[PDB]
């Protein structure tokens, strides 16, 4: 009983959460409609911890999908994955809302559909004997997921302040501003609520997702279907201590405690190397373990945009290196002999750092019985490069005179704008003070 | 023998025993035109208690059906079980009807059909060699079953003082007052005869009923025929230690005496798990039998609605949990380890409580030869809230200045209106004083 409730929210958050539930059946080796193999219970030792308990021989997701954009949720019930979602423990079919790519649209839809959002994750949090937490499958992209996503960052942390809250926030694309223009306003609003009513988050940058999406997956046109590939893999990978076997840090709130070092600095960086098209051509020369954390040490796998001149004036505190699949574990300490010699990762020389490595076996799946997959969950204190960027794209836009009255047309008839800026330079200053 | 003659009475009261008989033939695998099948003697060695003993080798239910609406009995006399029913021991075929839907109408028509009302239960009770008792499956819904059902609550507990008097009481809707407005007068007049002219009641709620009809079973818009489906299932489920063989407490006046000190506290809350109809094909491979008898104690399926915060300020005194079908009887003591372990039920600490656990075998028939079924007959003291709702709905209707003369048409020519107010307020205190 370490049950986690997913809150799939927004136009981009339903799509990243679709390929995450669809990924789980493909590795348990089963049909999304049922149990067709014994690898669902022999391979995943522990059957259900993201699904409600069995009384029909089916694994029914613990997902709520509320959105003000109905196209994305209509791409679920005409998908051949509409035999995984059973509507009666998930949601009532069709959920409508505002226009509404504004932050103030999804933010008000949380206050008049207030009855259903606080009556749908509590009809699904009553079977649990003790709740683990909430994963906010919400986005900063769009106003549907950033508006509704900003409300639940408060109300889940005054009612359940002990439960894990943690969002997979993906920023809206920062090399364009020709499809979204409300981007500096809605990002800073969620980040304030993240800095004083939050436990841990896992944030990613969308321009650093798309640098990998064209360098490993080898497409010439970035498309929001190749960007969602990176997010379903690292979601299912972080909890292969819990849902899949583990021992040390077997709770996902075990792993995450040593990735929280002090309030408002616990924004965890994600890295995941093996994605290449020909990753599977290295089983002719030995799928070795003598390079599977020299590729997690080598800096070229970042989903956070950050300089290479920030790797000698910042220092890591906690670094997680999860190796997955077959591994031959009697040479994994031999590989860890070798991390300290290159020093392409630094340590704070005033306090302790910790280099956690762990391995876990998985259900028959080609990426985890013939291939080595490495998830890094870093906590590097160079994360202030996104926070300064979000702030410079904000302070230039208020001088153009935009959204200081072009924003006050839905439930904002007061000022609160300099409350987000002032808090934001304290976060960057308290990050920068914490290493020397 | 222990033959009970059932007294179906009222327009609604007659329909809730009708669909009770259609269940009984289908599970003995008998044919409706007498016993013609050999599964009757080989399969189970007793089935009589509601069936008239052989003297022709054809069986007639021990039923009497009297009403002031012959309209309810024509929904029984056009059905092709009108050759299963043999009308000359049930009623003198094509009995007339009354005015009639006043409580005082059927109450005054009992005292000039005084001769016939005490012979039509003698021509249905002349085959027994020592009669056990009478169950009045009357109804409080409408003034036809309540009107005539009040008469038989008095003359059957003093012209047979040794026989068991017990009713399956069903209420009419307590949200509405436009489907029956005469509801606070007839309810309190019949509750009054239950606390000085009966020993046991069975309280079934109509407003928690349709709450279960949209929950586990799902109906698009509420329908006035649900009332006879939810009620008839718990009727054939309740007598399975006196139809089918038991062991301990096979005497019904043994279970009911361990339920009730005395009338003035006798209002039984019913709970019945199998209402999920996917549970029924997931019990081939075992659904866990350890939690299916803990969802009765907490409200997921109770048919009596009572406070969901007054379950820890009030105490159970007697709670019965009858398991039916498979359970594996040697892991029934493994489930009974866990009832005491949580202490979901609060108990009386001055003196003995009772955790009544009972189990029973069934007649061969696959939806009751492999399914996990739990029936609760509780006696919790928080039952004072329904009588506080009914009583507050009576004083308020009399302060509108009505049914104080627009109701004194037959047999009430005197003041006894404040006698039902004091006798209900007497009851509401004596339950609560019984626990310390």
């Amino acid at each position: 009983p370490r049950e986690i409730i997913t809150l799939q929210l927004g136009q981009c958050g339903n799509q990243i959460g679709f390929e995450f539930w669809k990924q789980l059946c493909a590795e348990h080796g089963i049909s999304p409609e049922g149990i067709v193999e014994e690898f669902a219970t022999e391979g995943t030792d522990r059957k259900d911890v993201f699904f409600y308990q069995a009384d029909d021989e089916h694994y029914i997701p613990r997902a709520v999908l509320l959105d003000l954009e109905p196209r994305v949720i209509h791409s679920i019930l005409n998908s051949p994955y509409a035999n995984l979602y059973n509507p009666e423990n998930i949601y009532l079919s069709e959920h409508g809302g505002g226009a509404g790519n504004n932050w103030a649209s999804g933010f008000s839809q949380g206050e008049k559909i207030h009855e259903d959002i606080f009556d749908i994750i509590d009809r699904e949090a009553d079977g649990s004997d003790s709740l683990e937490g909430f994963v906010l499958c919400h986005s900063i992209a769009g106003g549907t997921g950033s508006g509704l996503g900003s409300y639940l960052l408060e109300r889940l942390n005054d009612r359940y302040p002990k439960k894990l809250v943690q969002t997979y926030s993906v920023f809206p694309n920062q090399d364009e501003m020709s499809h979204v223009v409300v981007q500096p306003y809605n990002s800073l609003l969620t980040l304030k609520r993240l800095t004083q009513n939050a436990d841990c988050v896992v944030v990613l940058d969308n321009t650093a997702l798309n640098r990998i999406a064209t360098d490993r997956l080898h497409i010439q046109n970035p498309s929001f279907s190749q960007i969602n590939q990176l997010v379903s893999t690292i979601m299912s990978a972080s909890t292969t201590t819990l849902r899949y076997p583990g021992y040390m840090n077997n709770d996902l709130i075990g792993l995450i405690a040593s990735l929280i070092p002090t309030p408002r600095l616990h924004f965890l960086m994600t890295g995941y190397t093996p994605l290449t098209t020909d990753q599977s051509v290295a089983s002719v020369r030995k799928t070795t373990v003598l390079d599977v954390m020299r590729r997690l040490l080598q800096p070229k796998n970042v989903m956070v945009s950050t300089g290479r001149d920030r790797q000698t004036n910042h220092c890591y505190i906690a670094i997680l290196n999860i190796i997955q699949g077959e591994v031959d574990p009697t040479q994994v300490h031999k590989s860890l002999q070798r991390i300290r010699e290159r020093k392409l990762a630094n340590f704070i020389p005033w306090g302790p750092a910790s280099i956690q490595v762990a391995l876990s076996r998985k259900s028959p799946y080609l990426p985890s019985a013939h291939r080595v997959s490495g998830l890094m969950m870093a906590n590097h204190t160079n994360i202030s490069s996104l926070f300064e960027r979000t702030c410079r794209q904000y302070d230039k836009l208020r001088k153009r005179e935009a959204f200081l009255e072009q924003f006050r047309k839905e439930d904002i008839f007061k000022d609160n704008f300099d409350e987000l800026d002032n808090s934001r330079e304290i976060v960057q200053q308290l990050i920068d003070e914490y290493h020397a | 023998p222990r033959e009970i003659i059932t007294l179906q009475l009222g327009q609604c009261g007659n329909q809730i025993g009708f669909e009770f008989w259609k269940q009984l033939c289908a599970e003995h695998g008998i044919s409706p035109e007498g016993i013609v099948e050999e599964f009757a003697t080989e399969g189970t060695d007793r089935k009589d208690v509601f069936f008239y003993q052989a003297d022709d080798e054809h069986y007639i239910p021990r039923a009497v059906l009297l009403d002031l609406e012959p309209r309810v009995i024509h929904s029984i006399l056009n059905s092709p079980y009108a050759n299963l029913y043999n009308p000359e021991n049930i009623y003198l075929s094509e009995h007339g009807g009354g005015a009639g839907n006043n409580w005082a109408s059927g109450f005054s028509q009992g005292e000039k059909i005084h001769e016939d009302i005490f012979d039509i239960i003698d021509r249905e009770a002349d085959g027994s060699d020592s009669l056990e008792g009478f169950v009045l499956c009357h109804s409080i819904a409408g003034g036809t079953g309540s009107g005539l059902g009040s008469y038989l609550l008095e003359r059957l507990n003093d012209r047979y003082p040794k026989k068991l008097v017990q009713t399956y009481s069903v209420f009419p809707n307590q949200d509405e007052m436009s489907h029956v407005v005469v509801q606070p007068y007839n309810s309190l007049l019949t509750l009054k005869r239950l606390t000085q002219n009966a020993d046991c009641v069975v309280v079934l709620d109509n407003t928690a009923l349709n709450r279960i009809a949209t929950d586990r079973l799902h109906i698009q818009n509420p329908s006035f025929s649900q009332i006879n489906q939810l009620v008839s299932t718990i009727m054939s489920a309740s007598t399975t230690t006196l139809r089918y063989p038991g062991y301990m407490n096979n005497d019904l006046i043994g279970l009911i005496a361990s339920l009730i000190p005395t009338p003035r506290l006798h209002f039984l809350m019913t709970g019945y798990t199998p209402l999920t109809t996917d549970q029924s094909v997931a019990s081939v491979r075992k659904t866990t039998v350890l939690d299916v008898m803990r969802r009765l104690l907490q409200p997921k399926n109770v048919m009596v609605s009572t406070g969901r915060d007054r379950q820890t300020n009030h105490c159970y005194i007697a709670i019965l949990n009858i398991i039916q079908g498979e359970v594996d009887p040697t892991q029934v003591h493994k489930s009974l380890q866990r009832i005491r372990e949580r202490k979901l039920a609060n108990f009386i600490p001055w003196g003995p409580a009772s955790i009544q656990v009972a189990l029973s075998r069934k007649s061969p028939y696959l939806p009751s030869a492999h399914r996990v079924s739990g029936l609760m007959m509780a006696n919790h003291t928080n039952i004072s809230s329904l009588f506080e709702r009914t009583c507050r709905q009576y004083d308020k209707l009399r302060k509108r200045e009505a049914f104080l003369e627009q109701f004194r048409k037959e047999d009430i020519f005197k003041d006894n209106f404040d006698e039902l107010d004091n006798s209900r307020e007497i009851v509401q205190q004596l339950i609560d004083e019984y626990h310390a």
Binding site: - | L336, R340, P352, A353, S354, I355
Partner: protein, 64 residues
Amino acid sequence: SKLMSVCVMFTNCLQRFESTINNFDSNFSAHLMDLLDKLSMYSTSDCEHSMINIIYRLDFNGFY
């Protein structure tokens, strides 16, 4: 047998219709002072599998 004697003694009293009822309570309280010595007579073995089921039913006996 003594609890049965208070049972027929109580059906006799309801047929005949103070000091009488207290004599009822001492006979029910006579079986509670006995059940209290039973819990220590049941727990005393030297432990193994057979006795721990026998104390387990008797703890449910006082609980009932």
